Amino acid sequence: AADTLNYFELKGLMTAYQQRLA
Amino acid sequence: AADTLNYFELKGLMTAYQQRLA
Q1: In which domain of life is the source organism classified (chains A, B) (predicted)?
Q2: SS3 per residue for chain B
Q3: HEC sequence for A1-22
Q4: Which residue of B has its CA nearest to A13?
Q5: Chain B closest CA to A1's CA: distance in Å?
Q6: I need a labelling partner for B12 at 20 to 30 A (CA). Which of A4, A7, B6, B18 fits?
Q7: CB < 8 Å to A13, chain B
């Protein structure tokens, strides 16, 4: 039931934030 | 494999593509 966080992009925002900081 | 790819950045990138092209 983890996909609820994956369907709604709670997981992509953090990766984008990380990528911009790097 | 699905967990690795990022559906967020590709959408953002296509958006920037079109907004510049305009």
Answers
A1: Bacteria
A2: CCCCCCHHHHHHHHHHHHHHHC
A3: CCHHHHHCCCCHHHHHHHHHHC
A4: B8
A5: 14
A6: A4
A7: 8
Resolution of the structure in the document, Å: 3.2
CA distance A22 to chain B (A): 15
Question: CA B2, CA A15: separation in Å to the nearest integer?
Answer: 14
Residues in A closer than 8 angstroms to B3, CB to CB, are: 6
- What is the experimental method? cryo-EM
Residue A5 near residue A11, CB atoms below 8 Å: yes
State the smallest CA–CA distance between residue A9 and chain B in angstroms.
Answer: 7
